[PDB]
Structures are given as structure tokens and as C-alpha cells.
Chains A and B, each alone.
Chain A
Amino acid sequence: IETVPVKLKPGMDGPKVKQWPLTEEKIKALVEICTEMEKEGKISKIGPENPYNTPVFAIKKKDSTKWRKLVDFRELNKRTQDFWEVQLGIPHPAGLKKKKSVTVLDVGDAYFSVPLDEDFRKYTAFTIPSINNETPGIRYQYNVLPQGWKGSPAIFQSSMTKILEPFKKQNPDIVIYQYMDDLYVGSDLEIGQHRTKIEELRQHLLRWGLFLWMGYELHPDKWTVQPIVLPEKDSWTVNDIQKLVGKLNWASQIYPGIKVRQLSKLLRGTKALTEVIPLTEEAELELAENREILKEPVHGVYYDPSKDLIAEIQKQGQGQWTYQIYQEPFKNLKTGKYARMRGAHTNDVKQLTEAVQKITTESIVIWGKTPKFKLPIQKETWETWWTEYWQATWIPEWEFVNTPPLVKLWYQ
């Protein structure tokens, strides 16, 4: 019934982010949603004396026909004073990534039951634009904790903490982690009961006071990881050996003990690229030693909670994508490979948008935060289309790569 006061970071004013173009379908969806939110007292119309703004759009979660409002609070979040909670900081649960099954639940609705500090409401202003700007954009601000805002989970924490005590005390082995509007629940249970605990959990939440029916299943135990592998052949051409030395030279930046001298020797002389070269024993042994080195973990690799996570993605063709997550170059914390057919047999950009959400989800589970993406696409193309395929309630940061990395094939 009371609100915890909130303020912006020193020397920072509220967000003033332009609302990007919305399709007619998304505008109608938002008008309908906000009209009901206004009636329920969650948002209120605002006057011209509020110059702030945050973009809004609409999405459809994984297999749901009902539109969901999604506010892009990325700017507000970086400007809102760090809301370290009474938790002293809930240490990210390292056991979540090790569970057999993890279901993701959207509990964002709970937030709307808690009032937002009156003096901070102005900074949550947003606009529902009109097609061709024919009529004034509809302006609103939040009266309650909004979904997608950094401070919502922080402020609702204490309430969530006691809302789950029962379930948690009766199920001390189940791991429950919260990130923004999602709740991650993991357990080694047989998928059949795992689901019972989940549906039980929400029925235990719905009864406790609050579309929570949806579920997203992940399998950390069956997750993608990749070692560096060299070809195994009976006959090597000059070209095969040139490609191998190139890959080994690249790998030597990750693994110090890698050697190519003996293999390079085979390449001395101006030979036809398709000519078959028999491997000497010295070159064969060198290749063997390198294979061994490549079976050992990378040296000096560690995660630092105060550093940003970086994610790079490469289009490998035929619907396959590779990616690496690291904080320091050549010190990969996670690498993977995707090849997926949710709807984009023929759409590069949908595929990349889905790869980005999958990687972010993995990142949240493992480290409790989102990475900064380096995307292989032109900025104009990405910004024109990503919102058409987005299905997550959070949004990571991203930048663009315009020069073809030479290291594409070495990762596939």
C-alpha cells in the first residue's frame, strides 16, 4: 500500500527516446491494451509538461495469439540509479545451469499490484503513435511498477521472496531464479513431474495473488559447447594443408603450444593447389601433438561479474549459425552452434533474431545477465525488421560488424 522512493542517477535526466514507426496492427493492439490498463489504474494520461519518452511496441510470446505490450526501457534502465536490493545482492545461482530441466515463466503481471513512487512516474512516459501522425500520439505514464524496468524486480523482490517461501520450503532442491519479468525454475525431475511442480507453482502463485500459463523448457545438461577439431584424411592436397596451417595459426592465439613448422615445410615450393602431398613423419607427429593440445581446456579462463559479456555470431549458411561468448578475446566462456527451423527456412533475419534470443537466454541462466552482441548484418536491415520476430520480454544491446571476419570457417 506504500511505495519505495526511486530517483535517477546524479547528473542524469529522464529518457527522451524517439518512438519508432509502428505497423497498423501493433498500433491497434496497443490502443486496446492501454485503454484497459488505464481503466485499471495502471497507467494515466499525461500532459505536455512531461517531455520524456521511451519506445513501445507489441509482440507475441512463443506460441501465443494474444499481443503483449513491450516497452523498450533500455535507456531508462541505464539511467535509473542502481537498485541494489536488501538482498545485498542475491548471488547468481550457479546450480541453475546444471539442472536437467528449466522452465521459464512470465510473472511480469505481479508488478502491476505495486504502486510506483509518484515523483518517478514521469520518467516512464511513452507514446502510442498514430498512422501518418494524423492525430496526436496518445501519451501515458505508469502508476505501478512497469514490466521491463530494472527497478521493478528489485522493488518487488521482498514481495516475491515471501510469496514463494511456502513452495521453496517444501521443495528445497528446486532452483528458482528471477530475471526481469521471467522466473526460471530448474529441477532434475522427470519432465512429467517437473511440469507438475511448475503448474503447481503457478497455481500456487495465481492463488497467492496474480499470461502466466505459458512455459518455456530449456535443457542446460544437453547444452551446446565446442572444442576445436582438425580434419582426419588419408590424402592431403596442397590446399588442404594450406587450410590446416591457417586454422592452426589461428588456434595458436588460443593455445600457446600449437606448432606448424613441420607442416609448413610440406608447403615449401610452388606446387599446384590440387597436388597430393604425402605427410612426412615429422609433420604427422606435429599434427598429432596439436590434436592433443586441442583436447585440453583453454588456460586462464574465468568469469568476472564486473565485466561485460560479449557475443559474436557468424552465418555459416544452410541455416547454421555459430557463436562465442567471452569477456576477453580468445578466452571463450561459451561457444555454440545453431541450426533451427522456427519459421525462417528462407529468412536470414528471422534466424538471426531467434539466435540472438537463444543466446541471451543461455547467458541469463549461466551468468544472470545479457551479453552485448556483435551482429553480422547492416544496421539498417536489422533495425527495420528485428521487432517483427522478437518474442522476449527483455532486450539486449547490440552493435554491427561490417567487415567479413576471416575466422568464419574455423568455427564451423
Chain B
Amino acid sequence: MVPISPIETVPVKLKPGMDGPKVKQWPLTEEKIKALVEICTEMEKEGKISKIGPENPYNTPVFAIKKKDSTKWRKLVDFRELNKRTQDFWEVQLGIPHPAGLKKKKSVTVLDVGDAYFSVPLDEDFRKYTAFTIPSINNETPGIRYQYNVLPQGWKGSPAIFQSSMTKILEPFAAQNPDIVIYQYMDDLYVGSDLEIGQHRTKIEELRQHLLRWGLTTPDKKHQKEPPFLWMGYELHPDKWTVQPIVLPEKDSWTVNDIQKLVGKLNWASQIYPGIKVRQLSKLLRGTKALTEVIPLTEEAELELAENREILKEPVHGVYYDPSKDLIAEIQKQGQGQWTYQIYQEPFKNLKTGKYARMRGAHTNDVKQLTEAVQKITTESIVIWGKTPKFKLPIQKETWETWWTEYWQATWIPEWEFVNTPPLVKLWYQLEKEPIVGAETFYVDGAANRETKLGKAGYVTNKGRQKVVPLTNTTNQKTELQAIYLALQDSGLEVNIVTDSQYALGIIQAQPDKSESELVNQIIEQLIKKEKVYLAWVPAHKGIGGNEQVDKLV
């Protein structure tokens, strides 16, 4: 007997205020019982479970399911109730590594460690809560009672406890062997290195020797798994990665579900296939919520899909990360609030790609969208590579400077450079900071009756020019905007406009270049055509002449 180090148990507790499960065992057929008795007999002989006295008051239902119509049976202990009462654990699985962040490896060996799983003892004081009962033949004797000694499959804490136990064992090996990487997924350990293969195989034997100190043995065979690997929807190869085959189905008619499925595939594909578009297809799902409801494909969407099938025509792979080189992120504007990007280190060899869609909102502008895309890429990059990439953006350095020095909010974009690839992001208009000498002054105003919804919009100018237009189905806010629009329409290339609308100023000072309001869009089109515009604000109902509210008070 060679002494082995025991595996420390994790102390587990039920949620505060809760007791163990007391669920009634289900009636089973004579056939299933003999099967369960046989099954439990060896488990017991194997140390996994132990017979318990009548004292224990807890219970969990055990079942028997035939195996794909085999000669064998399998036991299923349903821990759903115990799981609802078991404490929460730290789940280290959240946020999986992204392939573009991985490093290329010459070799990646796989080791089966499913057996090690049963060397992990379950906290002695929690064992009682795992009690179960194999009914007796004909219910004429007491059912056989057992409780677990090891992590039960299906129990809430098994995955976290198994992983943390294996990690603690592996820790010193990883630390003292910096030339290898170890990753656990399910019942396997994946060990990779760039070592001359002889030395790599030696490292594997050392790992098996290390694990034996806890009496954990490994198959001593050549695991079936070898590069490439199918993992979390990706294909990992020694020096490249890609997403698993994306197949867009041919269809004569699509339903809400089919489209949600399609968009899911396109989104997954967009991380390496450049240009993928999903706006025209996504908007079709605007409040449908009926999986079966067949929706007709707009010609706009039929076009987007055809463009995507083209992009998905042939396989595309991304390369792995080389810590010794800079990271570059290039962005392009696609239109309709869509943006696309590529992250690479060497020209034409993307590590990954991606897209960004503008946020929901009444008014927006291209510079703000570009900024949001930059922030999103920056954060993703910190997660995957731990650093910010250098950016290549379709906006002139001069345009950016004019924008941020004049914008009312603080804003920032990290180290970047202009890349001249249309369409370029630009500022479409810029209001004056001071009144224009020589330019006609338009005093505008609008008002609407809250009940009748009737209103008026208009202006009076220093040259005696005047206009008042009657409006229906309107509000104070819309008449205020209409008044400004009339002034822009009827003035020359330079104009001074005086308004008392805090609402209209709130919008224009936000500098939108596009809006969900056709009225605001018409105003933007006029601002773009003018040479100079000064917009002045004054308090309403304060006896400021030109403030011709009277014309619109009827």
C-alpha cells in the first residue's frame, strides 16, 4: 500500500431556513427494482453509497430508465428538490475563453479524468440529505435505504465541487510547469504546449504521476480526442479557429421562430465572417411573439439574406493571438445604424470580426454611434486580450476635434488613426456661436390646444416678413418644431432664429444628424443647406418682442 493524499471535502449547507428534501419514492415495477438493487449493490461495493438505518428522515426519488433499448438499465436519482434547497456555489464556468484570445499550440493532448470524479468525497454532514429508497418487491419488507458518499450526478454542487477540487490538485503542477496550459472541460483535461514533442510527452507522464499522488489514475490509452476539437460551437485547430459550419436553410416561407433561429446563426457567424448583416431581418421581429406566425420577407430583408449567403459561401478562419504583436481594430459604417469591425495583428489575418448596431432612441448621429462602437470593442478587447487595440476609423482627425471640443458631454476615443475608406463619418452642420450681422432675424413660435389638438406655427422678422400656418392633430412640441422649420424654409442662406422652446433647443443642442421624427429630419435637411445659423433661446411669456405668441394664441 502506497499512501495517497486525501481530497479535502467542501463544507456544504442548505439555504438558510430550509431543511432537507422529504420526497415520496415512486412505485416501481418488480423488474426495475431488481435492476436498481443490482445497480446499487455494486455502487455500494464501490464506496459510492452506503446503506443507512431507519433514523434518517430525508428522501429523494430514484428512477430506472432503459438505455436506448439495451439489455442494461440505469438509475436516475432526481435531485431537483434537493437542488432547490442547496446553497448557491461559485460557478467558475461563466464567461468562456474566446478562441481569438487563445495562443497557437503545437500539441494538445487529452486525458480522461472521469474516474477521479469518484475520489471526491461529499461533505460528511451533508450526506444525510442525499438519502434515497429502492422500494421492496411487493412492498412486503422495508425498502433499502442508501445515502451518497461521493458527489451525486445531477446534484447542484457536483460540477463546481469537482472542478474546484481538480483545480486545487492541478495548481502546483501548472505553476511548476509554465510551458504548458491545462484546461478542464467535462471529464477531460486538455494539455497544450509548444514543446518539442518528446518533452511534451514527458510532461504528460509527469502529470499522470502527479495525479497518482491522490490515487487518481488515467486510461493509459490514446484518448479518442485529437485536434481539431468541437467545443462550445467552435472548431479549434492547432493554429487557427472558426465557428462550426453555419448552414442557412432554403425556405419558401419563414416564421418568427425560423427568423430568430436565422438571426442567431448570423450573430454567431459575425464573429469571424466579415460584413454579416442582421438589421433588415431583425426588425421583422418587432413585437411578433408568436413562434408559428409566418412573416413575409420584405425585399429589403430578402436582399440582406442573399448578401449573407454570399458571405457564408466559403469557410473563413481566424488566427490565434500573438502576445508579442500589437492589436489593430478597424471599423466601417454600413448604414442604417449598422457598423462592422475587424481585429487583427498582421494585415489580412483577422483574429476575429464583429458588428455593432445603434442603440434605440429618438435622435442620433454618426459620431456618437462610432464612439459607442469604439467603447464596445475596447471592453471586448480587454476581456479577450487584456489590452486596448489601436483603432483605424473612417473619420478625419479634424472632424473628431471639432466634435469633442464643442460637444456638451465629455467624450473620448483611445489612440486611433484616420483610414480613408468611404463612407466617411462627418459633421453635417454647425450652429453659430454668435448672432449673424446682416442676416434676417426670425422670431418663431407655435402653440396647440390640448383638447382640440389644433395649433398654429409661425414667425415674424425684423424685415416685416411674417407667416402663420394653421395646423391640426398636433401638440405644443410639434408646433414649436414646425415654427423653426418654417423660418429655415423661408430665410436665405444665413439666418438668426429666436425661440422660446426649451424642448426644441434640447434636441438641436444634442446635434442629431438623423431622427425618428420626420419633423426633426426636415429641420436637419434645412440646417445642412444653410451656410450660417444662429439659434437663440429666450424665456416664454416674458414680454420679449418678436416673441409673437399672440399670432398663434387663437
Contacts and interface: CB of A to CB of B under 8 A. Distances in A.
Nearest to B502: A406
B544 A273 contact: no
Interface string B438-465: 0011010000000000000000111000
A132 B544 contact: no
B378 interface: yes
A273 B435 contact: yes
Interface in A244-303: 245-246, 249, 260-261, 264-265, 267-275
Contact of A273 (B161, B382, B496): B496
A343 interface: no
Nearest to A270: B546
A158 interface: no
A134 B408 contact: no
A133 interface: yes
A393 interface: no
Contacts of A24: 385-387
B409 A376 contact: yes
A384 interface: yes
B255 interface: no
12 contacts: A23-B382, A50-B90, A131-B101, A135-B174, A136-B92, A260-B542, A269-B546, A270-B548, A272-B440, A274-B435, A317-B406, A380-B372
Q: Which of B368, B406, B411, B498 has the most CB of A within 10 A?
A: B411
A408 B408 contact: yes
A21 B411 contact: no
A383 to B, nearest CB: 8
B443 A270 contact: yes
A403 B384 contact: no
Given A261-B543, A267-B544, A246 B386 contact: no
Contacts of A317: 405-406
A50 B92 CA distance: 12
Q: How large is the interface on A (under 10, 10 to 19, 20 to 34, 35 or more residues)?
A: 35 or more
Contacts of A315: 408-410
A148 to B, nearest CB: 21
Contacts of B372: 378, 380
B375 interface: yes
Contacts of A380: 372, 375-376
A381 to B, nearest CB: 6
Interface of A: 21-25, 27, 47-51, 53, 131-137, 139, 237-239, 242, 245-246, 249, 260-261, 264-265, 267-275, 314-315, 317, 347-352, 375-378, 380-381, 384-385, 403-404, 406, 408
A23 B92 contact: no
A53 B89 CA distance: 11
B539 A245 contact: yes
Interface in B362-414: 368, 371-372, 375-376, 378-379, 382-388, 404-406, 408-412
B202 to A, nearest CB: 22
Contact of A132 (B98, B163, B537): B98
A305 to B, nearest CB: 31
Interface of B: 10-13, 87-92, 95-98, 101-102, 157, 160-161, 163-164, 167, 174, 181, 183, 368, 371-372, 375-376, 378-379, 382-388, 404-406, 408-412, 435-437, 440-441, 443, 460-462, 496, 498, 502, 505-506, 509-510, 534, 536-539, 542-546, 548
Nearest to B359: A380
A160 B342 CA distance: 56
B445 to A, nearest CB: 12
Nearest to B174: A135
A21 B382 contact: yes
Given A348-B404, A377-B409, A381-B371, A49 B545 contact: no
Given A51-B88, A246-B537, A384-B378, A268 B101 contact: no
A412 B435 CA distance: 19
Given A48-B160, A49-B11, A133-B96, A381 B412 contact: yes
A132 B404 contact: no
A114 B319 CA distance: 51
B460 A242 contact: no
A239 B434 CA distance: 9
A48 B89 contact: yes
The 8 closest A-B pairs by CB, nearest first: A132-B101, A24-B386, A348-B410, A264-B543, A269-B545, A268-B545, A270-B546, A273-B435
Contact of B387 (A23, A239, A275): A23
Contacts of A403: 506, 510
B102 A132 contact: yes
Nearest to A315: B410
A160 to B, nearest CB: 34
Contacts of B383: 21, 132-133
A355 to B, nearest CB: 9
A134 B97 contact: yes
Nearest to A28: B386
Contacts of B404: 348
A377 B411 contact: yes
B435 A237 contact: yes
A284 to B, nearest CB: 17
A300 B95 CA distance: 54
Nearest to B506: A403
A403 B509 CA distance: 9
B412 A136 contact: no
Nearest to A137: B92
B542 A273 contact: no
Contacts of B378: 384
Contacts of A350: 412
Given A24-B387, A132-B97, A51 B87 contact: yes
Contact of A267 (B101, B368, B385, B545): B545
A357 B97 CA distance: 35
Nearest to A262: B543
B397 to A, nearest CB: 12
Contact of B375 (A25, A134, A352, A381): A381
Given A48-B90, A48-B160, A133-B95, A271 B462 contact: yes
Q: Which of A48, A53, A385, A406 has the most CB of B within 10 A?
A: A48
